[PDB]
Amino acid sequence: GQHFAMEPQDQTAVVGSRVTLPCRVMEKVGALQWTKDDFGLGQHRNLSGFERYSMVGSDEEGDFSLDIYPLMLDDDAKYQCQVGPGPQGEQGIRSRFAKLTVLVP
Template sequence: MKINFTHKLKILHPFFYVVALCFLSTKAEEDNTDLRFATQPTHQTAVLGSTVVLPCRVIPRDGTVQWTRDGFGLGTIRRLDGFDRYSMIGSNEEGDFSLKISPVTLEDDSEYQCQVSSKKGPKLRSRVARLTVFVPPESPSISPSPEVSATAGVNVTIKCESIGGRPAPELSLRFL
């Protein structure tokens, strides 16, 4: 019996299709971890000397997590060497790698990003979050004194100032 070559392929085609489908399905399950951010950092403000937490939660927990400040990698361990005021807090099991900064200084006024290097896929990067550090100004001073007597029609100069502050303070006078 002589079998036509094209006929032979037609007979084997369904078998190859099933084998190929099983292989591709298994390969896809191995490569696709569906790695994503459950929580990403957002822009925040903090007062000088306070504590701030930038959230980062990755699911499923896979790969190595690192925070960057202005594009510079801060490290991959929870207690960040060389950055004593920085630490990654949260639970490894839950994929929580939030960045805690305490106490906040002017140096921390920067852009931050949470990054994950997955073992099975491309690097995952959160949105960039801007941390703006505010500095309270000194109490305002009024001169010549807080209470000024004036006579109608006579000009009086009153000086009100507040030193420091970020952003610069806005002052206004109110007359009673």
């Protein structure tokens, strides 16, 4: 079944930098999406309106990491990697929540 090969971890970073929240999925059947404070960022890598977020990894590798750049204070939140159910009855999955902390020097 579909499952995480890698899940995001708590991170602390400095404003202005790039951050990568890791998410790798094996045997992905459902549609994938990140939540930020439980707000859905978009499925199928389509993050319209979030000009500083992207998901440039490849499907083959199951790379669905979230990149953020440049980091801003508003990005200080809790993030989760989500995969919806498959068309064949495959259940969806949810990664641990990762707390992204933003510092200012």
